Amino acid sequence: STEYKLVVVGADGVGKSALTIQLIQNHFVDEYDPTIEDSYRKQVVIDGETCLLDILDTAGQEEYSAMRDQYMRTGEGFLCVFAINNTKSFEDIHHYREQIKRVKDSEDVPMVLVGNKCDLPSRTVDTKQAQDLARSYGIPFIETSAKTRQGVDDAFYTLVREIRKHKEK
Amino acid sequence: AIGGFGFLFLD
Numbered sequence: 001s002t003e004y005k006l007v008v009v010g011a012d013g014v015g016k017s018a019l020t021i022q023l024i025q026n027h028f029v030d031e032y033d034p035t036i037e038d039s040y041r042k043q044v045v046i047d048g049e050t051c052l053l054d055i056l057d058t059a060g061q062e063e064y065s066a067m068r069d070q071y072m073r074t075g076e077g078f079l080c081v082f083a084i085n086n087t088k089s090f091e092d093i094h095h096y097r098e099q100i101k102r103v104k105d106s107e108d109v110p111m112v113l114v115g116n117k118c119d120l121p122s123r124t125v126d127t128k129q130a131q132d133l134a135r136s137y138g139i140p141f142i143e144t145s146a147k148t149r150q151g152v153d154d155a156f157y158t159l160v161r162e163i164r165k166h167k168e169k
Numbered sequence: 170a171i172g173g174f175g176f177l178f179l180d
C-alpha cells in the first residue's frame with residue numbers, strides 16, 4: 001500500500017461529509033452534523049497501486065486541533081467543493097485556493113474543483129463558469145452527486161493522480 | 170491566521 005493525505009474543503013452545506021461517507025461506506029446520508037471535522041481512511045486500488053487515502057472532511061473550527069494541524073503540515077491534495085445550486089459556495093472557491101497555496105507555501109498544489117449536487121435540477125452555477133475557473137488554475141473539474149455516487153470515485157481518483165504527477169516533477 | 174477565508178481560523 002501507499003499513503004495519500006487528502007483534504008476536502010468548501011462552504012458549509014456543499015456536501016463534503018456526504019461525498020466522503022459515500023466514498024468510504026457506500027451510502028448517502030441526508031444529515032451529518034455540519035460542525036464535525038474528522039479523518040477517514042479509504043482503501044482502494046488506483047492504477048494497479050494499492051492506495052490508503054487518509055481524508056480530512058473539514059468543518060468550521062476556532063480552537064486548535066491536532067488533527068487539523070497534522071493535515072495542514074502533511075496534506076498533499078485538496079478537493080475544493082462547491083454546490084452547483086449555490087453561487088455563494090462557488091464564489092468562495094478562489095479564497096480556498098489562495099489559502100491552500102499559502103498553507104503549502106507553493107503555487108503548485110494538487111487540487112481538483114468539485115461541483116457537487118449534480119442530481120438537482122435548479123442549477124445556478126454554470127458548468128462553463130466552473131470549467132473556465134478550473135482551466136484558469138490548470139486543475140481538473142469534476143461534477144459529482146454524493147446522492148447517486150456520480151463522479152465521486154472520479155473526484156478522489158483524479159486527486160490521487162494529481163498528487164502522483166506532482167511527486168514526479 | 171492564514172487567509173483569505175476560505176477555512177476559518179487557519180493558523
Ligand SMILES: Nc1nc2c(ncn2[C@@H]2O[C@H](COP(=O)(O)OP(=O)(O)O)[C@@H](O)[C@H]2O)c(=O)[nH]1
Pocket residue numbers: 010011012013014015016017018019029030031032033034116117118119120144145146147148
Ligand atoms: N441532492 C443532493 N443533496 C446532497 C448532496 N450532497 C450532499 N447533499 C445534502 O446537502 C446537505 C449538506 O451536506 P453535508 O455533507 O452535510 O455538507 P458539508 O457541510 O459540506 O459537510 C445535506 O442535507 C445533504 O444531504 C448531493 O450530491 N445531492
Ligand SMILES: [Mg+2]
Pocket residue numbers: 016017018032033034035036057058059
Ligand atoms: Mg460536514
